[PDB]
Predict the 3D structure of the following.
Amino acid sequence: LTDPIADMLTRIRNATRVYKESTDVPASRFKEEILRILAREGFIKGYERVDVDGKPYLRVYLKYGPRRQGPDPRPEQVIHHIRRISKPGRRVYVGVKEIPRVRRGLGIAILSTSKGVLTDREARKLGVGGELICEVW
Amino acid sequence: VKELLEAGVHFGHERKRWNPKFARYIYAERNGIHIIDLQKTMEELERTFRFIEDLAMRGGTILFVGTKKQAQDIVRMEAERAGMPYVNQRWLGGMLTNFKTISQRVHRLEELEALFASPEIEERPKKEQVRLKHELERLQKYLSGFRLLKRLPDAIFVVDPTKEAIAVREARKLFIPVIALADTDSDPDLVDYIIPGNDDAIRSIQLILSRAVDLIIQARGGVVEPSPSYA
Amino acid sequence: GRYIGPVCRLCRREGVKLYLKGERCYSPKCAMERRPYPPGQHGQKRARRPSDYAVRLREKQKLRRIYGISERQFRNLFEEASKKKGVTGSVFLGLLESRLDNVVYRLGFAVSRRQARQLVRHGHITVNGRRVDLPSYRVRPGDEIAVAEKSRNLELIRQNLEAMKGRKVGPWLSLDVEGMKGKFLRLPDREDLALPVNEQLVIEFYSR
Amino acid sequence: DFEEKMILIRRTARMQAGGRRFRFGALVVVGDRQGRVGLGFGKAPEVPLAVQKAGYYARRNMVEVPLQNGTIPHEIEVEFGASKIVLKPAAPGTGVIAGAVPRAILELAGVTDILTKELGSRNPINIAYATMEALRQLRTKADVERLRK
RNA sequence: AGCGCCGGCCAACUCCGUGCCAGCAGCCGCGGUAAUACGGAGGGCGCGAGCGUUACCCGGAUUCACUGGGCGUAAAGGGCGUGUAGGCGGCCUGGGGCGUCCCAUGUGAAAGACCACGGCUCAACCGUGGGGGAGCGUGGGAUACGCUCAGGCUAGACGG
RNA sequence: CUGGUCCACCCGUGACGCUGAGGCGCGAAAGCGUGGGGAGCAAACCGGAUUAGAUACCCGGGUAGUCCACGCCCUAAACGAUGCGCGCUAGGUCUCUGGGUCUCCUGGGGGCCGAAGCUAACGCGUUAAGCGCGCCGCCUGGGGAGUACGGCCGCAAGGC
Ligand code: SF4
Ligand SMILES: [Mg+2]
Ligand SMILES: [Mg+2]
Ligand SMILES: [Mg+2]
Ligand SMILES: [Mg+2]
Ligand SMILES: [Mg+2]
Ligand SMILES: [Mg+2]
Ligand SMILES: [Mg+2]
Ligand SMILES: [Mg+2]
Ligand SMILES: [Mg+2]
Ligand SMILES: [Mg+2]
Ligand SMILES: [Mg+2]
Ligand SMILES: [Mg+2]
Ligand SMILES: [Mg+2]
Ligand SMILES: [Mg+2]
Ligand SMILES: [Mg+2]
Ligand SMILES: [Mg+2]
Ligand SMILES: [Mg+2]
Ligand SMILES: [Mg+2]
Ligand SMILES: [Mg+2]
Ligand SMILES: [Mg+2]
Ligand SMILES: [Mg+2]
Ligand SMILES: [Mg+2]
Ligand SMILES: [Mg+2]
Ligand SMILES: [Mg+2]
Ligand SMILES: [Mg+2]
Ligand SMILES: [Mg+2]
Ligand SMILES: [Mg+2]
Ligand SMILES: [Mg+2]
Ligand SMILES: [Mg+2]
Ligand SMILES: [Mg+2]
Ligand SMILES: [Mg+2]
Ligand SMILES: [Mg+2]
Ligand SMILES: [Mg+2]
Ligand SMILES: [Mg+2]
Ligand SMILES: [Mg+2]
Ligand SMILES: [Mg+2]
Ligand SMILES: [Mg+2]
Ligand SMILES: [Mg+2]
Ligand SMILES: [Mg+2]
Ligand SMILES: [Mg+2]
Ligand SMILES: [Mg+2]
Ligand SMILES: [Mg+2]
Ligand SMILES: [Mg+2]
Ligand SMILES: [Mg+2]
Ligand SMILES: [Mg+2]
Ligand SMILES: [Mg+2]
Ligand SMILES: [Mg+2]
Ligand SMILES: [Mg+2]
Ligand SMILES: [Mg+2]
Ligand SMILES: [Mg+2]
Ligand SMILES: [Mg+2]
Ligand SMILES: [Mg+2]
Ligand SMILES: [Mg+2]
Ligand SMILES: [Mg+2]
Ligand SMILES: [Mg+2]
Ligand SMILES: [Mg+2]
Ligand SMILES: [Mg+2]
Ligand SMILES: [Mg+2]
Ligand SMILES: [Mg+2]
Ligand SMILES: [Mg+2]
Ligand SMILES: [Mg+2]
Ligand SMILES: [Mg+2]
Ligand SMILES: [Mg+2]
Ligand SMILES: [Mg+2]
Ligand SMILES: [Mg+2]
């Protein structure tokens, strides 16, 4: 394994696309920070720490829309799109004035800064920049 | 309404040839077949019967659809007890999406009903007579229950959605709610109001359809006691 | 310099009345009241479906021919309006409406924009006292436009101001017929101009 | 009722013993310049019948198009079988910057200011379907907040 | 008052002459006896002291794809291993603060680009003022992430 | 004599990993060198038919070669026309091979049908052509052409 953060985001995307209730991911503190940001913004119901085979895991609880009427009744998504930005093979850093605005304000961007893991609006309010982790809308 | 009588007549059906999406209504595999969770059956039945009663109160119509060899008789009597339209022999493709074109045929049916009576005409050539009598037999065979439909219905009652996927497709396309009795080889997403019961045994279908039509009859101010029960 | 040929054919081609002649435009003998089809041999044949480019080109040409401005000046004005802050269509219309010849046509010292151009060019109009002989001069709010003191006793000017004693100028303008002098109050609004033009079509034309 | 704009007409052929026999396909967009737009693709042996059938299909498939000040609430990128459409909101004076097919679809929907680009395959039918899908996926801020909180 | 154009792209159509000739042509293509495509005429369209043509550069070309492409059958997986340099790398704790980010300061000349005002009757042109601006030096701060040092863990890897 | 690989026990080490420009090794058949061998078959070759002709298809013969040792050559529709590693995403069915609580569950291979998804379509679909990350190789209209020239390799044929 080479990218735990991208792996966790892929687990979330794959579990969400089949309307699962919850998905497990190997635990880590940085992953926990990103999950806390996601929960505060309403993209997931929440997360918790559990043990699988004696190993620490994080269980994420997915959230969806109401049932739809028609040929396709599958509910619409709350996480339409989640993408990793900075990668092991190419690191992406932005200053406070290069902070992207995702989806004209409907989406969010997650930043790793010296003040912690922040949303792009949070970082702009604090006037700080750093590594760009991912974008969610 | 039901009160635990479900177990006596049925619990479920179908072995490993299952649809995994049905897993939310399965309890165990004992002989190789899946046993439906009867508490989930009751919980779904409450909602389904509440919706049925609310629809019957407002005067809407329900189209009872069932064409298996285990329901050609139960469906007919149950739907006739309420004076309700039904499809019993074969779903004609487009019976709902092409309702105007298909219902143009019941006009011919009724016109041929007024043709063979003694008063007016018996002077047609005999070969043309046999042609028209073939046409009348086919129209009566395939449209005897469909005749009661004067408009698109407000719900369709289907006894097996896997077997009757074309009817479910037509209903879902037209935004008409679908109620279904479904065993473990069925897709519950396409069914708005599910009853997770066995739909291949005679007594299970009899119980469900009979009590449903009792509720419909009650929703119009009356109590008709006897139903055709056939061991 | 400018277009100096027949002018009713422009109205007949555009399909609408462009009041480019003055008195004859309101007379029954207006060419748009007798032959409302395009000029030439094929003007009375059934029209084919106009393409998108044709529609935008015709709208732009209508707007340009209303003011009698060359395409180079028109495009320079459009790019200038696009540079300015403000809705580019409204800014462009205001910039077009601020030309001196158009301003003195609206004030009533002339009956047509061509006549207003000849009046301005021939030294008959003064802006804030000093004489201006340039039609393209851009009037700013507050500027006073008037007839030259030695030009007040001119028959054409006398008749023009006589015929305007009843007519009322737009809200963005003020006139003193007795004082023979105008005043440019503000940039005209888009609703104040009765222009048979969709300026969105002109903007989209210049986006190509 | 709605304004009707004819987007595409084409003649297709099939073969039999005897030669080619023709059919006409009409792509038609229907809208009221107030938020409703629909697309229809009708095929018929004759052109006026094809246009009539296309309009009939268009009136039975409409989208709600969440307009705001003549523009769209956010940028959108949509793929339909090797065709790609990019839509982006713009200021009230921009106008509609698009190719003929997206321009017709967006103008009949009530969009007055937008920036668009077509990428990949430029087939008009697939571009029109991609435009319709992109208009279907538009969400306002109220929608997303009703979804998340 | 002129120049180009009028088959599609692309705005603007009829008559006569010719007959795979003469000729046109950026691509597709026109012309072989009823040519909106050649030549002329009438008419029309676009610009206008200009209008066309040739040459070259960017665009359209997401057609070298960082933004922003691909490789089963369209062009494209090396015949297969082993492996050097290089590129990338699991969980927890502390130190450093190199990358990274922030603050102050120096530099980033003038002219040019932008914004405002102003002088030539306007404009081109010019004057004044203000703001930006990648990068680099210096001083200070932060430590989430990458790096680095140290100490642990066993889910990767290897061994019995 | 010797390589790989799988399962069970959960015993030891403690991130020791993945990929890999060059390098090195292996690499069907045919072919080449020196010895041996040679039944059958059989390029070239001879004859008979067939045919307008028949430098073929059919028939009768027939030498290298096919076999062995050693040394070269290094190519292919060397194909799953699909690089390797890791993680995640319904199932059903057939089969090979292990462990168990031997109805059945739990590993590792080989096939068929299919969720979601993907694809221009054909089709793929836990043995991905789906969703992702890391590293390598390759493509940029057809022909000229895998040609020419230069360089390296080979006894040659010829290869890169
Ligand atoms: S008389 Fe009529 S047609 Fe002629 S220029 Fe005046 S408005 Fe136009
Ligand atoms: Mg890197
Ligand atoms: Mg359908
Ligand atoms: Mg396409
Ligand atoms: Mg694609
Ligand atoms: Mg293309
Ligand atoms: Mg045209
Ligand atoms: Mg020609
Ligand atoms: Mg010419
Ligand atoms: Mg001729
Ligand atoms: Mg031409
Ligand atoms: Mg000619
Ligand atoms: Mg440009
Ligand atoms: Mg192009
Ligand atoms: Mg480019
Ligand atoms: Mg491009
Ligand atoms: Mg790229
Ligand atoms: Mg490509
Ligand atoms: Mg391929
Ligand atoms: Mg492919
Ligand atoms: Mg090929
Ligand atoms: Mg290619
Ligand atoms: Mg190929
Ligand atoms: Mg290979
Ligand atoms: Mg190959
Ligand atoms: Mg090999
Ligand atoms: Mg090596
Ligand atoms: Mg290796
Ligand atoms: Mg190698
Ligand atoms: Mg190494
Ligand atoms: Mg530092
Ligand atoms: Mg400077
Ligand atoms: Mg001035
Ligand atoms: Mg200055
Ligand atoms: Mg410093
Ligand atoms: Mg690290
Ligand atoms: Mg360590
Ligand atoms: Mg091996
Ligand atoms: Mg151990
Ligand atoms: Mg230890
Ligand atoms: Mg690794
Ligand atoms: Mg390398
Ligand atoms: Mg070999
Ligand atoms: Mg071989
Ligand atoms: Mg050999
Ligand atoms: Mg030999
Ligand atoms: Mg022979
Ligand atoms: Mg012969
Ligand atoms: Mg032989
Ligand atoms: Mg022989
Ligand atoms: Mg021999
Ligand atoms: Mg092979
Ligand atoms: Mg290949
Ligand atoms: Mg490949
Ligand atoms: Mg490789
Ligand atoms: Mg298997
Ligand atoms: Mg299998
Ligand atoms: Mg298969
Ligand atoms: Mg498959
Ligand atoms: Mg398979
Ligand atoms: Mg592919
Ligand atoms: Mg190319
Ligand atoms: Mg070579
Ligand atoms: Mg050579
Ligand atoms: Mg040699
Ligand atoms: Mg070769």
